[PDB]
């Protein structure tokens, strides 16, 4: 049974994005705490990630974008406003006290784990703080400041010829896509809502460019997708992907805003369905790096990643939530699982099979025997 490494820094739950802001880092602390009380903590190798310095963040980002982040504060907020606009820091990506500390922990977790995978001293490595996939080389976007994912992947390329990147998050993983848009060594597959939704990118025809053409897979989706519909379009596509792209290390971003009843999301997935993807990936027995991502009904974010951690340990846990410091957060029910809503699935079988086929064609363009 696969060996799992879990990365966590106690401080991460305590950093705060701002009044009225949906991204709430505290959800990782909630997970952490459930893991301890579900007895899972016990069963995996627990690491505190040291802070990632500007040194390794600039391995992808601008020497003067990170410089800006290292420097900016809420003190000198009116002094910098020039650079604030050039870098996207505001309306939905606030400045906030500790921001750079927050980035260092998220990035440290992902990088340390990548190394751990390259050093071949784990099979799976988990960092729920990480997964922040909207970030760009020279600007912040969609609550993401540093793209820990790219940096993580860049380290893996040192030992792995082909790195597969899978993205479940309801929002299209455009940061990780754009960063690797012109390379054939990394294939970015993404399943997301599309049409009057952020980030506006990742439609059927977004295939890549140059050497990276036919290496950026996307599955655009409308509202209300079931576990059943999602499963029936994830497994086929990913089996082909493995078949064709034949990777040697997987990085699964396990965005939890694709769950039902999310604050920002509008999909109808249950923890069970959501996790079935993690389990399917894990089954391909490749060095795997689970990251988190979005998720804005934190009670369920907690539930999800707690469950999905169990999946990486292939151990069973009861629906009965164990007592914990935040036990009272979990409704009148205090259960682990969520059920789907009456919400209407506007992804007709006809619409999913059209897209599926187009992707199967795209994937066939890769070399094989």
């Amino acid at each position: 049974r696969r060996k799992v490494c879990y990365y966590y820094d106690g401080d991460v739950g305590n950093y705060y994005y701002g009044q009225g802001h949906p991204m709430k880092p505290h959800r990782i602390r909630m997970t952490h705490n459930l893991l301890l009380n579900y007895g899972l903590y016990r069963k995996m190798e627990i690491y505190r990630p040291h802070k990632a310095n500007a040194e390794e963040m600039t391995k992808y980002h601008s020497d003067d974008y990170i410089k800006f982040l290292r420097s900016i504060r809420p003190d000198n907020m009116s002094e910098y406003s020039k650079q604030m606009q050039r870098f996207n820091v505001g309306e939905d990506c606030p400045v906030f006290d500790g921001l750079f500390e927050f980035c260092q922990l998220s990035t440290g977790g992902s990088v340390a784990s990548a190394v751990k995978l390259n050093k071949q001293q784990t099979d799976i490595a988990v960092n729920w703080a990480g997964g922040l996939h909207h970030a760009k080389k020279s600007e912040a976007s969609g609550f993401c400041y540093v793209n820990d994912i790219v940096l993580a992947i860049l380290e893996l390329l040192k030992y792995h010829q082909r790195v597969l990147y899978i993205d479940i998050d309801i929002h299209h993983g455009d940061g990780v896509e754009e960063a690797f848009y012109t390379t054939d060594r990394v294939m970015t597959v993404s399943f997301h809502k599309y049409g009057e939704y952020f980030p506006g990118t990742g439609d059927l025809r977004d295939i890549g460019a140059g050497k990276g053409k036919y290496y950026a897979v996307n599955y655009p989706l409308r509202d209300g997708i079931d576990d059943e519909s999602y499963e029936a379009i994830f497994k086929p596509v990913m089996s082909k992907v493995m078949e064709m792209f034949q990777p040697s290390a997987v990085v699964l971003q396990c965005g939890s805003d694709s769950l039902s009843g999310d604050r920002l999301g509008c999909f109808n997935l249950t923890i069970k369905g959501h996790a079935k993807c993690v389990e399917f990936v894990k089954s391909f027995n490749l060095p795997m790096l689970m990251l988190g991502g979005g998720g804005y009904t934190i009670r369920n974010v907690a539930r999800c990643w707690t469950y999905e951690t169990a999946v990486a340990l292939d151990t069973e846990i009861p629906n009965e939530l164990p007592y914990n410091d935040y036990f009272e957060y979990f409704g009148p029910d205090f259960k682990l699982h969520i059920s789907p809503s009456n919400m209407t699935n506007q992804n007709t079988n006809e619409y999913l099979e059209k897209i599926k086929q187009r992707l199967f064609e795209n994937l066939r363009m890769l070399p094989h025997a």
């Binding site: 009044q19 009225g20 009116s78 002094e79 309306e91």
Partner: protein
């Protein structure tokens, strides 16, 4: 009166809890220009600032 970092320098936000009546316990949010002019809604603030800021994605209540 708290600095609102996402607005230009000197802009501040204050939240006031209602002490009595129909909405006792609810709050009201106010902004102050650098000179101290008081604003009570998003459209009033957007009219004042004009094209010097884009407030489309600005959450008046949280100041983010």
């Amino acid at each position: 009166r708290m600095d609102c970092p996402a607005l230009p320098p000197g802009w501040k936000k204050e939240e006031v809890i209602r002490k009595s009546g129909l909405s006792a316990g609810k709050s009201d949010v106010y902004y102050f220009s650098p000179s101290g002019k008081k604003f009570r809604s998003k459209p009033q603030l957007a009219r004042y600032l004009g094209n010097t800021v884009d407030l489309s994605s600005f959450d008046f209540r949280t100041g983010k």
